[model samples]
Target: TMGNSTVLSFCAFAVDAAKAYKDYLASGGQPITNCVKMLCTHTGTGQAITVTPEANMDQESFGGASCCLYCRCHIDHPNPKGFCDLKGKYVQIPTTCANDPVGFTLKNTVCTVCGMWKGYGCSCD
Candidate 1:
């Protein structure tokens, strides 16, 4: 008797992982550096399997237009180079990628969810 439990469980996990991956991306995270997504297919039964990450936001803040936020580490990489995880305290700045003279290459920037700015000077608007 081939129960559907295995398939169901796999589906559930895959959905959760996908959501997590989305959140990670939304929080200004690199998919390649953060998590991995793979599609598995069965030629015998035409069954397909997908693995992804779940939504896990560490810290996200917004101020007018600027913002700062922390995204959960979906990949098993170290800090600075990549997110550490939920336990690791780290925040990434999207603007830095555009202005930083270091020529830091941002894998993805369309996923930023929060905003922040430092040293308030003056607002004319």
Candidate 2:
């Protein structure tokens, strides 16, 4: 009787969570553009496993006696600094700007002489 209850609980949680995720996506939430990975474990067997680039959250039943379901985001979007034109890459300042032996402290500045403006830094090489 206890085993049956556990199986039922796992199934219910999986179905509900999967539905919620789909609903959230349909409701104007930002869709995951990057690849995602998921890890699912079988509570009955206690064997955990991982899956990469999951396609969907639909639950699956195993052997008509056990079921498992789990999902998670694997990868994330690249940092904005890499591509945003207004952001500048960190670089060592010229000796003129260095006042101490350690040289000028790292600063996030645009490539332009005007410095940062409107939350945008000049894009530097």
Candidate 3:
């Protein structure tokens, strides 16, 4: 969940909390027998993601699960941090197609991910 500066700060804090929890577990710390649910709310885009233990009834458990999340932007868009152009008629996403695996794709080329021309498909190069 990548966002502006403010939101990114919240994410950083969440990472810290996760790290603390991991450390607690490593120290043989015991938590509530009930399931522990972690809810992360992004300050930037108002997006939220939740993580919880699997559905089961256990008295005590000791283990860890890892998750990774990153942000991506369309390069074609006007944003400088992005990789592709969002406007213009000739914009292409080579990563989205196998045939055009190098740079940009032609206007008529199909996007491997979306299975449509540059106008109406997503590519998976």
Candidate 4:
């Protein structure tokens, strides 16, 4: 059995916790629901250009568009490159890979050029 003041305090805490969770989700914190889609088109010179959301996606699933699918980074090494996580989020590279002579290479599971670590795959739209 709790006193009235105790109950009131508990209620306030619960409400605050719920609100915090909601804010986190709204800020793109994990368990993503708004998965993005993309459209890949060919330039006259045979270059591939990617459009988003309604890329006129032909018979393919749009769910495959990674959040950082096309992101790139600059680092120095044999191939200084990186990619975004499956969710298009940035994953940091080891300090060793942060040297000079940066070429194009893939770091971590995804590239750092995409952005900070947060949420699921590419927001290509």
Model 2 per-residue lDDT tens digits across residues 71-122: 1211111345423221121222222321211111112232344332212222
Q: Which candidate do you rate higher for TM-score, 1 or 3?
A: 3
lDDT tens digits, residue span 1-125, model 1: 22223322332355353354345445654332221111222112111111221112321211211111122212323247754222222223222232320112122322222222122111221
Best by TM-score: 2
Q: RMSD, model 3, all Cα superposed? A: 18.7
What's the TM-score of every candidate structure? 0.17, 0.19, 0.19, 0.16
Local distance difference test, candidate 1: 0.25
lDDT of 4 by residue, 2-103 (tens): 332342233235534334333543565432222233333411111111122222121121322222212211111122454322333222212232221011
Model 4 residue runs over 4 Å out of place are 1-69, 73-88, 100-125
Residue 42 Cα positional deviation in candidate 4, in Å, after optimal superposition: 42
Supply every candidate's count of residue pairs whose N, Cα or C atoms clash at under 3 angstroms: 13, 1, 15, 21
Error of 2 at 47 (Å): 27
Q: What digit string (tens of lDDT, one per residue) describes model 3 on residues 1-125?
A: 22233332333455443344344434654421211222222121111111221111211111111111112111122237643322211122222322221111212344444433444333334
Per-residue lDDT, model 1, residue 26, is 59
Measured with C-alpha atoms, the lDDT of residue 96 in candidate 2 is: 36
Residue-pair clashes, model 2? 1
Flag regions of model 1 displaced more than 4 Å: 1-15, 33-125
lDDT of residue 63 for candidate 1: 21
Name the 10 consecutive residues with the lowest summed lDDT in model 1.
45-54
Model 3 earns a TM-score of 0.19
